[PDB]
Amino acid sequence: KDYESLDYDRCINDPYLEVLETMDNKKGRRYEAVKWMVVFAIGVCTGLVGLFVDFFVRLFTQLKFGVVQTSVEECSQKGCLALSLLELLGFNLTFVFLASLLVLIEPVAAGSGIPEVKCYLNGVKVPGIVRLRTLLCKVLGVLFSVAGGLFVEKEGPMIHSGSVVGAGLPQFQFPYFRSDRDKRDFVSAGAAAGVAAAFGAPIGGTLFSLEEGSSFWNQGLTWKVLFCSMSATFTLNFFRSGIQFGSWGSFQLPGLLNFGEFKCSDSDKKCHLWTAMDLGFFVVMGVIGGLLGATFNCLNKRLAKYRMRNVHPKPKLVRVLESLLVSLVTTVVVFVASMVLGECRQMSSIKTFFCPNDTYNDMATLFFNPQESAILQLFHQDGTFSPVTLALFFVLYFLLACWTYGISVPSGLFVPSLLCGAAFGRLVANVLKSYIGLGHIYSGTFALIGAAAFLGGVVRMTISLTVILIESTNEITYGLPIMVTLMVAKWTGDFFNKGIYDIHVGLRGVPLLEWETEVEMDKLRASDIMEPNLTYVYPHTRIQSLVSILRTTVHHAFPVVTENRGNQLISNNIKFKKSSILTRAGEQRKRSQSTMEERFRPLTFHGLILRSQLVTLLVRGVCYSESQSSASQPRLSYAEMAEDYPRYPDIHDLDLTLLNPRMIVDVTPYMNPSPFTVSPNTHVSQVFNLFRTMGLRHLPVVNAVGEIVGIITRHNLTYEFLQARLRQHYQTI
Amino acid sequence: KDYESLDYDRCINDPYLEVLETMDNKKGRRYEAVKWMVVFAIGVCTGLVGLFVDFFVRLFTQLKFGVVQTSVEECSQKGCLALSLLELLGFNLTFVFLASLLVLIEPVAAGSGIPEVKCYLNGVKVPGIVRLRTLLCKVLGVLFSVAGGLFVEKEGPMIHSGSVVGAGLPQFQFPYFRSDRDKRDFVSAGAAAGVAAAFGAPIGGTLFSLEEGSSFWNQGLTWKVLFCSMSATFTLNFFRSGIQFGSWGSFQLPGLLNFGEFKCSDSDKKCHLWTAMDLGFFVVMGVIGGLLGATFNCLNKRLAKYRMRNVHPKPKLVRVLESLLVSLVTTVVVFVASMVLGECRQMSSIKTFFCPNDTYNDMATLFFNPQESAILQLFHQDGTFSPVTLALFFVLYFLLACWTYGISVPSGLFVPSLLCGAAFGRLVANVLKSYIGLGHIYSGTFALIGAAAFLGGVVRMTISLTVILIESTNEITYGLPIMVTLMVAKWTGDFFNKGIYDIHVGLRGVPLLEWETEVEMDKLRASDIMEPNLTYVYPHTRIQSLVSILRTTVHHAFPVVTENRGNQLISNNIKFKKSSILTRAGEQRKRSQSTMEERFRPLTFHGLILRSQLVTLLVRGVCYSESQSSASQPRLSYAEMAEDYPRYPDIHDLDLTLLNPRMIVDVTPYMNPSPFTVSPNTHVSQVFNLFRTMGLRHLPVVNAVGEIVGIITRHNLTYEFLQARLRQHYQTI
Numbered sequence A, B: 001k002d003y004e005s006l007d008y009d010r011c012i013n014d015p016y017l018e019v020l021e022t023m024d025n026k027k028g029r030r031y032e033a034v035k036w037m038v039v040f041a042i043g044v045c046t047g048l049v050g051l052f053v054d055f056f057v058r059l060f061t062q063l064k065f066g067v068v069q070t071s072v073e074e075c076s077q078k079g080c081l082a083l084s085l086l087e088l089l090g091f092n093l094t095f096v097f098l099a100s101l102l103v104l105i106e107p108v109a110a111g112s113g114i115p116e117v118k119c120y121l122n123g124v125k126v127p128g129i130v131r132l133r134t135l136l137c138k139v140l141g142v143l144f145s146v147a148g149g150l151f152v153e154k155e156g157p158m159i160h161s162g163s164v165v166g167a168g169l170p171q172f173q174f175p176y177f178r179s180d181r182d183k184r185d186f187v188s189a190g191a192a193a194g195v196a197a198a199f200g201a202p203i204g205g206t207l208f209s210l211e212e213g214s215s216f217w218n219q220g221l222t223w224k225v226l227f228c229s230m231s232a233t234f235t236l237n238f239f240r241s242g243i244q245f246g247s248w249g250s251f252q253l254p255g256l257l258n259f260g261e262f263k264c265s266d267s268d269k270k271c272h273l274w275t276a277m278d279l280g281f282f283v284v285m286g287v288i289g290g291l292l293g294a295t296f297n298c299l300n301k302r303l304a305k306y307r308m309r310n311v312h313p314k315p316k317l318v319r320v321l322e323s324l325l326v327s328l329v330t331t332v333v334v335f336v337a338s339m340v341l342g343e344c345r346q347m348s349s350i351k352t353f354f355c356p357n358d359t360y361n362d363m364a365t366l367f368f369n370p371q372e373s374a375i376l377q378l379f380h381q382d383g384t385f386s387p388v389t390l391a392l393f394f395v396l397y398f399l400l401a402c403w404t405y406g407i408s409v410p411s412g413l414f415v416p417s418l419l420c421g422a423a424f425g426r427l428v429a430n431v432l433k434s435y436i437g438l439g440h441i442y443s444g445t446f447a448l449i450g451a452a453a454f455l456g457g458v459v460r461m462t463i464s465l466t467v468i469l470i471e472s473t474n475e476i477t478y479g480l481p482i483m484v485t486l487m488v489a490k491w492t493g494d495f496f497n498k499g500i501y502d503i504h505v506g507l508r509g510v511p512l513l514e515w516e517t518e519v520e521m522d523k524l525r526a527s528d529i530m531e532p533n534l535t536y537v538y539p540h541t542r543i544q545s546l547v548s549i550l551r552t553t554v555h556h557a558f559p560v561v562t563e564n565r566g567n568q569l570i571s572n573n574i575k576f577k578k579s580s581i582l583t584r585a586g587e588q589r590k591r592s593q594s595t596m597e598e599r600f601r602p603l604t605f606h607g608l609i610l611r612s613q614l615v616t617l618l619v620r621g622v623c624y625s626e627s628q629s630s631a632s633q634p635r636l637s638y639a640e641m642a643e644d645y646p647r648y649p650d651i652h653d654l655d656l657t658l659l660n661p662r663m664i665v666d667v668t669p670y671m672n673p674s675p676f677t678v679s680p681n682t683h684v685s686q687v688f689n690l691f692r693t694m695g696l697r698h699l700p701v702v703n704a705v706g707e708i709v710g711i712i713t714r715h716n717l718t719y720e721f722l723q724a725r726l727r728q729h730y731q732t733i
């Protein structure tokens, strides 16, 4: 497939120069005020979306459990036990069917949002990740999917929902924020707001949006996304603490996922959250979690390849039956595990099913209760669960989560991977309690460290994940035990496989730029990765040549150049070549006054022109006759160019009958005179640093004599291409 | 004055190419392991430095108070009251005299460290901010100064101490970390570790080190400075909780400054930390704090100008008497205010002086106790202080702190400005309690918001300050009230004056690059700010010309160029000019095979050469005779060049008698062939973005025909120069 990258690099021409000349300091102040207002509105809307999801998820799950529990009781009295299972299966099948249909409406809504958000912040523009229909389909699918008990999450897709809101909202409201730079900034702000609403950590969201889109440090935009995040996480709170509780002005609880309070349960001699002796246990748990994450990634990748090979090339009826099958299998498994193998233990959140008086079923309590309740019980309750219960729950949940993720329904991954780790940590703590005394430390710390290790194994994130976990825990003293677990579980896992998101984005074939290049990559030069073949546009060019090159070629940008070695066309080109050059003596005076050879020809680089501007010029009557001088021109303004910005007409779409051939079109005013260039003798690391951090596109390579020698595109800087070229370079010598 | 900037931009030549060719993947892994070890060692050493400061500060202050309190009692019994004052004055004078002498040893140790650290991370290299003597003098001065009761802090200079440790330590231990890039990275890590040790907030330190040195996002170095910060803040804890308390494995308290625990004092109906109705109070307190900060900055700037005009041009005897005078004045004032105007209130930390039975003096309790104890009492004690006490303490402390800062002794600023705000907030809370019921909210919140507002007014920091305050508070729910106070007190203050650090760095005359440029600055072009005059070096140049240009000129870099329009010299230059050019046809074939006019002359740009490399070449026997070809050359290796890295000999220092004139020196191998260049038609914003974020130096401007037209240096991008050039541009038209 082929994808269109974002045009993040700024383009400055005469219309923009006129707008800048008209611009004044008061206008700049008004612009900044409007930008602040838009940021605040984005935060508020993301908070409202989170509230809308959470309220209906809770309502549906509570109603479903209310219908079944009584039926469980009556059908257990006589011993039928069937109607309880039949009603549960009916509810699950209905919800999963609705979610599958909704995903069938919009294909990109499937799976977690993060794989399709790391690409937009990197500038790949997956074809359907901004459209409002995607937002509606995903937000409706998430509530239906989790209500069906598919072992999924809600905190995942909230990032994509916030990203869509941030991308869309400013467009609805000197055109305002038409350039792709502003769109990318607002997408970053929306992603940060979504992360804050999901996890309750504002600084974690700011740091997540800082990376995954790594550009030059923009002090003044980070200060805006932090405000957006703070507003987003304190609007969800203001309503979720006013609906659940009675007080309205109170801010009693952070966003969707909260771990609780980490303190010694009772005033006890020598009770601490953690001590220096536990560090070995933390390291061992980290490496175990890394191995488990590697196994999870391996099985998930194999399953994804199998589905991509067989299931996808099937009619629309298939890919809908698979979700129903997995929902049925998981419902049957959870019901059987609640009925049998669940140890009844002597005693509102706790559910007692199939169990005698004054006793509760731990398996049922873990499986039925919503994931937040299960997490809270695993962290802050001691002695409630037997080790066999924990082992069975961990194995079943791990296998079912590994099998489930990837199917059509809008799954999540943070919670179902945050739940197995807690169970493993609690099991480890229970084992350690028997052999040695554990009174000197808290019990829930092991569960927290296990959860952190499993996340580190599965997703393999850094910096952002550490901050998110620390600010969710609400205890800064957990800074060290968590981090030394994230940096170990990662290092253990990188031996076997990459992260889930990297695996699922490499399957799509999307080209992604890595963070840094190896030293062997630096050994290469820039002359080895450029593309010697070029498509060029002369200034004052023929309209027939323009339409021919636009129809024949697929490149999105053309270097406007002049030959180095119609009569009016040639005369105008020579006049421009003499007018454009500026010598140092001239500048000082101004200050004081106050075959293959034909194919590969020397050309002097003058600028870059985008395909969109050429199409816009062709659509309008932008041309002059050969007899007439180039002075006469429509001279379109900025607003006229931006009028067609959201949707750019295709060249084949245009009728093109009106256009008169043998007509000269001037592209000098509308081109980008000064793009970032680089000498062919430069090394790969500098080129990669520029092309990544500056976020630009189509980096031209020009030699010492001003001859343009090549163009570098993102396809030339992927890891596979660099590795292949390095292997070829070793093969040459 | 003139200052030498850091050479952050990487230089790649043939010795480095040889080292890279010898380099292997295993060697890279070993390099990364060594770098991690160095980072951890830096963190540990910074923690140890913090512990060393804190322990002796506590010991000295406790001993001084132990000597005086008994003498206070006996001399009060008869009514003399003199010996108590005499002993206090003697102690204060001795400590302040020692601190003043120690600062007299090293001039740069004076004042807070931050003004001299913002310059190094920006690349200015203040002449004495890395030397170990500065570290020793500052660390010894801080403990003596605060023990004298000069109304100063300890958290300020810890940043400079960590920076010095990070700069120095790797040098003590393929040369390792010789390039200035590694030195700057380690300085950033040391600054982050120092901030973490001072305030107990690791992420705050990471974010402080991220800004103030804004460069391209380096994922893989942030992940190292975060580890350094975490290790630094958890080594100070491990010892300060094992010395003060009894348990050794326990981590009971964060770094030097801790705010405590923010919870409702008793289980009470409708008790919350804060509610939505308080936001107006927070905004009003923020604007009041902004006005107060503006006043503080105004008076401090006027006093600093007065001292710079009169006090500084004086012999060394002066500038030592001023510190003694201020110490005497503050001791007399504090003793008198403790004796009189301190209201005795009915009842170990609390001090009862000059007061009858079962009563304590609030003035004495606030003034005598260490600043941490005063802060803790102001935050978490209600009803202890009368409003008159608070007003008098605030006024006196504000005036004395404004007068004190700037003198020789190593003062701090965070604590003395964090203490007035707390008093103001407590006074506001006490006033509000009388008029309206305040039972619905906590009392200390007003003190915290007042402190945050006063810091925002005085220092005017963002992002970093917010995170530092949030992670010191240990309550994420304070995210919004703090931040909406920082962003208001800043906006209120920016009307009148800049921050303290900006004022004190603008007085030194140091050129600093601002974060962003205005749109009017973008209206300017690059041709208007470049310097048309150049000093150039031909390849294969005469040694006499080299020595003449090195002695005559002061520029630190020379563009190696060739004329565009000895016989052996000219022949070699022409041969190099033909050998260097690479045409696109040639590259494709290679792949397939597999007066004033004399003064201002057209020159083709070939590279950049630093003065240091030229001096190194001159020191060694790097030359060849005219008859001999250029093939023969000593061909120095990387280690030989780096051997002289720490100290570069001056040209005037060299005897130069051995050097034989009329001898050709080849500089082609040792130059930087591919520096970042920019076209003269580019706009100012792009140039500023490159020259800032890439951290480079001496950005060359070359036109379309390859002619070099100018050089841009940091002196051309300061705010004053840009404003002057913009005014001139308006004047022209």
Ligand SMILES: [Cl-]
Pocket (backbone or CB within 6 Å): A153, A154, A155, A156, A157, A412, A413, A414, A415
């Ligand atoms: Cl999630």
Ligand SMILES: [Cl-]
Pocket (backbone or CB within 6 Å): A112, A113, A114, A155, A156, A157, A412, A413, A414
């Ligand atoms: Cl996810």
Ligand SMILES: [Cl-]
Pocket (backbone or CB within 6 Å): B153, B154, B155, B156, B157, B412, B413, B414, B415
């Ligand atoms: Cl301080």
Ligand SMILES: [Cl-]
Pocket (backbone or CB within 6 Å): B112, B113, B114, B155, B156, B157, B412, B413, B414
């Ligand atoms: Cl300071």
